[PDB]
Amino acid sequence: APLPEGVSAEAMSSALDRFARIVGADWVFTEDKITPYEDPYTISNDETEHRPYAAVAPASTEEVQEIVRVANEFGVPLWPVSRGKNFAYGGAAPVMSGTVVLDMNRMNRILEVNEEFGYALVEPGVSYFELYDYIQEKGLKLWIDVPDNGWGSVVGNALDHGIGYTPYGDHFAMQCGMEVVLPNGEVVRTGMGAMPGNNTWQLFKYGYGPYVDGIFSQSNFGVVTKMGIWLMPEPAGYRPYLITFENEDDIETVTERLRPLKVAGVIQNGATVRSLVLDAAITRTKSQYYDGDGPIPPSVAKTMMADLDLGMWNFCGALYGPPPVMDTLWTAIRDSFADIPGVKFYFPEDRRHKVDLLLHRAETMKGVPKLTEFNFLNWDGGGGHVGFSPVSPITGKDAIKQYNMVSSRVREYGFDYMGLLAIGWRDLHHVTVIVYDKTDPDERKKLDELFNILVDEAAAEGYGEYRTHIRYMDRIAKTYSWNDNALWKMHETIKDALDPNGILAPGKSGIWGKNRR
Amino acid sequence: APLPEGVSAEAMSSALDRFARIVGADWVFTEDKITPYEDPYTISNDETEHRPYAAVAPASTEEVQEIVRVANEFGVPLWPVSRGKNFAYGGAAPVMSGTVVLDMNRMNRILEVNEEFGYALVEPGVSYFELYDYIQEKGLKLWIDVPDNGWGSVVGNALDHGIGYTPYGDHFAMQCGMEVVLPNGEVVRTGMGAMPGNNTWQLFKYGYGPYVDGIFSQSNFGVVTKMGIWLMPEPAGYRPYLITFENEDDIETVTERLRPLKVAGVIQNGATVRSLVLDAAITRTKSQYYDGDGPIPPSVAKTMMADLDLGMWNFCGALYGPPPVMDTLWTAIRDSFADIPGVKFYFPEDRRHKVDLLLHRAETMKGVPKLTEFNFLNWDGGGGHVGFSPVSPITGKDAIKQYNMVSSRVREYGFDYMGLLAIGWRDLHHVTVIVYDKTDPDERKKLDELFNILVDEAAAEGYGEYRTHIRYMDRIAKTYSWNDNALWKMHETIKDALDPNGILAPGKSGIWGKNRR
């Protein structure tokens, strides 16, 4: 780990000393204890890149504030993580080496769960597992909404615009109220929490005046120390389904049919249409169907589909509510797809495998945290992953163009194509997942190169990334370049106003601050 | 109209001159032509307050930018309005006298309406009437969501956190993408619009990085020149209803029953439970039931209820979707209230009056713009109104405490109590509307005083205002005072960074800028 540029050993040493006084000497980590904070899915081949210098683990908001005041005095940068499980995005590691990680794992109090109003107020350390377990224990009739990684932070995930698979799938949309330590060490509360004596912090997003909560998501404009989130009341009924399509070209008409269903909200959760290999790899690995080094051939695809009762495309969704509602919505959904040759429709009871994609996703779509999804990392013997999830119109043409662009490249590079088409509400994402051997330098180099080209080519077709790995944060920022990067010039203006010393997470979302820019 | 403090006649004159060059001499207004921009509902008795000095009406974004550059050179403040129909909030008038109004009425292009994706991209001048009429003409299967004032701006209303009465009732929540002229004259686009070549500006809110759209709502951080908004697909069915309650104390149990219905979204639009007089005054005036100068007595309330088939509380709501869905949801809603003594349930066909509250609200709850609501201003012979709409928990106790606090004061002051309980999703608002004779100085003084006391007393019970009249913008801002006004210190930090010369709308949301603070 290099020192961060511009920062002396005397400075970094005096700071680490004062941090230790603030949080106690037990909660300042260095040297050997810093490896948990390295990116678990190494992309770079240069070991001077994305290296944390140290980590400090405060117990409270006020300790966070003192840390930040100290960081300001010594010019030492901080990289805040809630729990730091941002796997595929860098884990807990900074964009910039020398950055001291601010690990808020120990701030894990569930401050409130309110059944009657359907919310929680949580600290950054609270995991999905913990919140879920708290709810189950108290018997509250509330669902949470989990990403495929159950170990993540409710806070951290939402601040990064993460998603899940219930009607409450847009995590940051369900955010309501936050406490923030600003980069100068001042503490503020957004919304109704700015009003002393309110009982409305988790009931009404705006409060009064400029709506600023969003500026602390995908941002280095502050450290979030408390955050509210809305929780769905247990519904009166729940039916998960899987609809399979046999032909790779079906995704065009499938996307066309999904469009009105999503816009009108007939489909109540995110639509996910996953490619064969991405779904297969939940229950199977490559060597069980194909011994070659290259991607699987069509004949092997067909075998896999026949074994697993999957298609080339697999649409998982769920119905929620009283049976009459669920039946009516299902009529509309099923009728939208029934005339496509080869289509098949499944509820859980129709699956003949007891370990099965639908049975797994059934849990995720009712907000049960699991680690099952990490299975796809075993596809080629064990590896890391990176994901590329640009936004596009919900159009057949856009869906199949991205499929064609991505699969051809990915397969040319020797990887299997693992993709899905995700629809939030009016937004389509073609999500590429590439599993690679992160221990092999030749494979990292190929991945890095493939990734860049995918990004470049997608951007030119008008498809921009909304969430990315620490390594590509600058690159993605350059996508949004209208009027000579006018938006990022504004971000930098706010950055310098709130963080003149540039001590919060230099490089996050490609925002640097005047000192490093 | 006084000059704005700190600004010379030479400066104000050179600026008005350069504005005229930018937009043409026809589109700079002064003296007599400035009266349309006065508050129509005068509250102040001091005619030096909230007076606009001049108004300038650009044709384009780029003209806006040149105006702003000129404003910066001469230190002349601007007050931007989309259409300036903010009736009950000041209309088009500035907080601070001497402020030149930036009227964007002529920027009224509907840039796009997309049926397949359910959105519009509009300029600030577009009215609800215009957008509605455009849709009807083209035969697009889309609803809009209108406030009770149909003459408002789709943009302006949303930026002020305005509301309506369909499922798309939270206007700023449905906002997606905006173009903004910053206070330095630079132009930026938020979200996917920052990415050149996107077709996704109105499909995905976030883009990448800090989510900043909200900072330009209830704000003087920029001028919005284009804005996207999501539009609901025409639903498969629509049944509006009215549920009446006979007793003033029923609102307690009514609010308790509404809570789970709203949180779970069984009620698909905003719930509005309006008091007798507020609903009566849509079709009747006071002198038709009572000749006294004071508020109506109970005996007269009873007569009105029996004439109009209204209760002391009137819950308007609507069902949306296929009949099976609507029936199922109605079963849950009706069962939630059926056991309350005196309760009555109406669909349109059950109303015996052809001019009737439900028949009016039926239109509003399917997004048809109307001016009918302004009828309540005739309650006591013709007047203005002001509204007070603080947030509270959805609780019977909170509902009836606010009813008791407000009605007693309002009636003591000689006004009739006109109130409603509004529920967005998890948020209750007790909304006080007070109709007053705006031409009478004694009545203005009483109103102003009543308003202050209501605000003070509500704040102490933990109920804070989310939207207010230009006159009370500072006052409401002081509500949100946690940690020595930490939030507003942050607002002011951003204000000085984006607007160092303080030329955009000094005082909006009680944000002033370093020059005037």
Ligand SMILES: Cc1cc2nc3c(=O)[nH]c(=O)nc-3n(C[C@H](O)[C@H](O)[C@H](O)COP(=O)(O)OP(=O)(O)OC[C@H]3O[C@@H](n4cnc5c(N)ncnc54)[C@H](O)[C@@H]3O)c2cc1C
């Ligand atoms: C197999 C697999 C499946 C995945 N599935 C999903 C999925 O379905 N949905 C999804 O959203 N993601 C998914 N991910 C990505 C990721 O693992 C999750 O999003 C995870 O929840 C994020 O980590 P975290 O919650 O611990 O957040 P953190 O790592 O704590 O935070 C993420 C980032 O947010 C910022 N941040 C966090 N806390 C603060 C704070 N208090 N103040 C300021 N900034 C802060 C920082 O930039 C930080 O680096 C997946 C990854 C893998 C490998």
Ligand SMILES: Cc1cc2nc3c(=O)[nH]c(=O)nc-3n(C[C@H](O)[C@H](O)[C@H](O)COP(=O)(O)OP(=O)(O)OC[C@H]3O[C@@H](n4cnc5c(N)ncnc54)[C@H](O)[C@@H]3O)c2cc1C
């Ligand atoms: C009887 C009655 C009923 C009402 N019912 C409702 C209702 O149901 N729902 C509701 O929401 N309101 C309601 N109102 C309040 C108000 O009339 C409406 O909200 C109206 O739609 C707002 O005016 P406008 O749309 O022309 O916005 P504008 O007056 O153009 O804008 C409002 C404010 O937003 C800011 N602003 C506007 N445009 C920009 C921009 N481009 N850049 C920067 N800042 C900008 C300014 O501060 C401006 O003063 C009601 C009022 C009355 C008297």
Ligand SMILES: [Cl-]
């Ligand atoms: Cl969704």
Ligand SMILES: [Cl-]
């Ligand atoms: Cl084996």
Ligand SMILES: [Cl-]
């Ligand atoms: Cl079913």
Ligand SMILES: [Cl-]
């Ligand atoms: Cl709503």
Ligand SMILES: [Cl-]
């Ligand atoms: Cl008459």
Ligand SMILES: [Cl-]
């Ligand atoms: Cl019905």
